[PDB]
Subunit: 237 residues, 6 copies
């Protein structure tokens, strides 16, 4: 156990799915995992372990922001033997052709955080996902009949930015979605030698501001999780 | 309601105590406030409003990290009429003459985050607390007979730092405690026009590695809470 | 005609292979392309256009360094309708398990240049390749019975850097090879909306010099070109 | 004697008031101290030691700019046993509700200088004053019936700034006065182990351009001097 | 032999003239040198050594960009005993009074590259030429009845920069010409203890395109070479 | 008049010599100028105007540090019509072959200040002197039988550096002397379109710490001033 996770080696599977919202972790465990059990409750960051189609899988929230998810991912890798981390979240879109409910896979993640510069002697470290994990997720999506865009995400430190100037810049350079953790998780994976991937569903757009129908948004969220879980099986082969 | 808080104007007091842990907020509400009622549960970030010695007061968690707390403090200030924010957290000590459970008051907060440079044209913004609030806290501590040091805190983005040599630099410059939110809350208070103060309880020592348990951090740090609450009453007069 | 390319729209195929050594352009045209014709000679940067199994392909050198390749890739994209750029070069390795003559594919590229910060308002831009192109190269190599590693490349501005301490850092973060252009080409692709990929063969293993015969190098180089060319055909399917 | 001060241990009191102007130091010595004697003249940087209400006190100029005052404050602390430094200078106002001759107390000091980043591994060091000294100054002002605001100052390297837009940023973040030494004195106090405080008299307004004459700045800023001297006595008790 | 120069100590004179366009090396050898012999052909970078009025001189191209020229200049200095490097190139002008075909001499060179900061611990290194070489070039030009301007050059990493606002800044600070190598060569000279100078002829006037005949350019180029060569003889006296 | 100079247009010559010490300005006026008169006394920064061999010349101190001299040089150029500024100071040596009493001429000046980055959009501005002024000073020195080294100076913000690490770096890159103003004055000259030059005499060495005989040091200082004054006459021709 650590100050943030009251569990022991063995309590987590070697693969952990991670949503930002701890309440979303309980939702995922209840909906897709069989014979699941709660393995952490410290600070209310619920974690669960169960099986998917016979495969042992864990799911736990990571909180909002690079600093928060950096703590949890590091501990899972160095204290609980986790090999793969799959972040499952939401993002905002800036590109005109990326629409609501689009499933985005971040092969890379830009950021305005200073954490990777501190790690990489003030130079440019390209925060990327594990290639095989990206491939497995793209393949799982095809199998489910889902289209998925693979590209760059942007991990922001400030949800409420003082200068809405970076949005035009992100759009200019092709960023697919704006979130707050990918670059941090990729930095941790590289520093401690594990593999990671971030998958997101477009929750809102920079330009047009119009939702759809709850039922439809919730269907897309479940598709993302199915893509995540099915990508793991593909990787096991 | 705001993107991360499901409440309406009036649900929160004009002053809010904020620990990083939602579970500590719950404990504070049950132990120190009368007629306490839960006003928020989104993402599990519990918020409560009650009364202390007849004074209306709220207490809500803010999560770990500058990005997380920047979201909550901003929303409270712009949509719920919150005028004062008093962070009541934990921190790690670097100085040899500082021990577990000591209370520290951050008149200033250093940081390795980029958020303030983004707000201040890449220059050095001195993230400081509100003077009157600091004085109120000092007076309240003396009245309660509790010791408390006033000085600089260091708000880190990485709990697990890639270079421990920086701890030597922090020590040399007299940093009283290492935490992860102060500089962010102060930057937000200045940007959106409110007042803030951070009070911390030393929960661990970075050099000796002596630690307090998560349970202890969640329900046993009473001194700082007493100082915080009594300091508000002093401010009202 | 552009400042550095004396040709007209239509002279280049929509896909261009680019080696660092200009002398390699003529070799590739004569050895792998059919009905090749010369399309550029400015500053000695010889360019050729022909076909590979019916597919129109072009080849032209880019010169050493990010500044040089940035000029050529930009002009090809904005003035000659080029949609895909495939850099075929060499690199030095820092990892023990990465051996001489190995073929590496840069899904991403780190760097110590300031070009991307100039583009990305001094923030961290993850210079990445086009995912489909990466997957095409991997599948083409497999079909040719060649094993290739997919990961991060490091694009250095100084072949002779003042301090080798950075090589230790590169090794710690999993960099597969050290070269001098990838991060620059990826930046151009993002800025002008095109696709790019860098494939490299390990020609030296910094801090560990082994031996190879001119015939072995000939073989490995030809392997890299066949992988690149077959990858394009896969992308067309 | 030190490189810039021709005196011996004992010549200076353990507390020294320091204006940027040597001529103001002379005026302070002749107007407020009894039995005042000149102890330094090197480079024209006049220093004096006398008594105030029986209390031994010194007053010496420090010159304009962080580099200049860093030299003098360091030498006093390391070779003359000086424990407290109280800067009594002038500043320019940026806020509309601030007028000429208003007194300001810098609890913190922002800056565009690189000196603190050089000391703090390129991170954000919050240059703050000694809390007790700030409180002493506030109490002394109230006792004298003089108004005084407590807040952030901005220490500039360029009196004639290349970009006036930064003044808008300073105003937005509530900077009370623009001067050129505070952040430097605070950095020195922390590095060499002493305590410091900066008190300023608004001598001009950056927006309205209203100005005070050089003669006025040299011999008419009495309020801040009274607060400074009386604050020391308070500290002794 | 070095990685990029297949030759031995003694093959190059202690003074080397370097154009950016490799094709210019053979032209200079045939047109101005006596008894010239080929000494390099690696990667197509042709090098020649001969004599000018009895003085041993060498000529070889350096390629476009700081990274490229940094490789060649370094190897020449550390492995072939070269003591002086004279870059003979072209540049674009931003100042009104600087006209097409003008000859400019870079006593100093500004830059947006990070190479010198990497060398100078992230501080400002003034990349300058050797004073005597500058004075020799000025006197040689005068003797040839040619007027030359001596000032700052700007070495750009991106020929196609994302924002032309910097050209206004360059104009304001007196930059005479924009090119892509000077600052890099000067850095190498300082790092390995050698002497360097960059002479350029204005080939374009950014934001103001005029006209010139191929014969006029031929003349101006020959003028620059004669100035460079005669400058060496002056330096020997 | 300005807040720093109580004089009027005409009071200063179009050429001003500037030592750091205001007392040195009186020494220079008294020793080399005829019919001189004091033209400024504000803050004790004495300025004088007289003639040298019939030529009208001024001399005034600039204080220690870039921020201080930046104020005075700017005002002289924009408010008093000064065309040339010649700083005459002292410096510390780092190179083994640069000995005490050597006369150094800074054709360029490195720095750890941020002032030129603020001016030059965060890029590298090469702070250089006016070529003709450097040439005139070298010529005047020859005429007086004095040897003078021309090269780079380093302008430090901290006389008492926290990291004596930069000294080896300066030596590594050939810096001739360490002082505190050159880079700032060159920045002002460029920003407001005037000409400047810095000449220094070696007052101390980094390695060997041994003086000579006052009479000898004072002879060298006067030689520097004679070089300065005689360089002006040469320029008038
Ligand atoms: N438009 C958006 N902008 C930012 F900055 N973050 C977004 C957005 N949409 C969703 N997120 C994700 O949800 C959380 C913040 O509400 C964070 O966890 C974040 O990853
Ligand atoms: N040693 C420590 N280092 C850092 F960076 N933060 C610390 C430490 N001890 C306690 N904290 C505070 O508690 C949370 C992390 O457990 C964060 O919310 C943080 O503010
Ligand atoms: N070890 C190496 N280090 C660096 F910096 N670049 C390398 C290395 N091996 C090959 N290259 C590639 O060949 C050229 C430089 O010789 C450049 O074009 C570059 O991409
Ligand atoms: N508007 C102003 N801007 C700046 F930068 N400094 C100011 C201003 N007014 C007064 N000062 C203070 O007085 C001196 C400069 O006259 C410096 O010593 C400085 O601290
Ligand atoms: N206007 C110009 N802008 C830039 F950036 N470089 C210029 C220009 N004119 C000529 N050059 C010189 O020629 C090459 C680039 O075409 C490089 O070798 C460079 O030194
Ligand atoms: N060794 C030295 N180091 C530094 F930083 N400055 C030096 C040195 N010797 C002389 N100076 C010059 O004299 C003043 C500082 O005493 C400043 O005005 C400065 O220019």
């Amino acid at each position: 156990a650590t100050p943030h996770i009251n569990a022991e080696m063995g309590d987590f599977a070697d693969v952990v799915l991670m949503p930002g919202d701890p309440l979303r972790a309980k939702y995922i465990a209840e909906t897709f995992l069989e014979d699941a059990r709660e393995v952490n409750n410290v600070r209310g960051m619920l974690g669960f372990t169960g099986t998917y189609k016979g495969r042992k899988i864990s799911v736990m929230g990571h909180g909002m922001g690079i600093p928060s998810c950096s703590i949890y991912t590091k501990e899972l890798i160095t204290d609980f033997g986790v090999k793969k981390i799959i972040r499952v979240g939401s993002c905002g879109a800036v590109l005109p052709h990326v629409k609501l409910r689009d499933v985005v896979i971040g092969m890379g993640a830009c950021t305005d955080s200073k954490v990777n510069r501190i790690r990489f002697k003030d130079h440019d470290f390209a925060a990327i996902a594990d290639f095989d994990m990206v491939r497995n997720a793209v393949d799982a999506a095809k199998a489910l009949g889902i289209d998925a865009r693979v590209g760059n995400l942007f991990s922001a430190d400030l949800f409420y930015s003082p200068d809405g100037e970076m949005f035009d810049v992100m759009e200019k350079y092709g960023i697919l979605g704006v979130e707050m953790e990918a670059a941090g998780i990729y930095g941790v994976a590289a520093e401690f030698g594990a593999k990671a991937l971030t998958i997101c569903t477009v929750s809102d757009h920079i330009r047009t501001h119009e939702q759809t129908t709850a039922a439809e948004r919730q269907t897309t969220f479940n598709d993302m999780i199915k893509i995540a879980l099915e990508s793991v099986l593909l990787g096991d082969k």
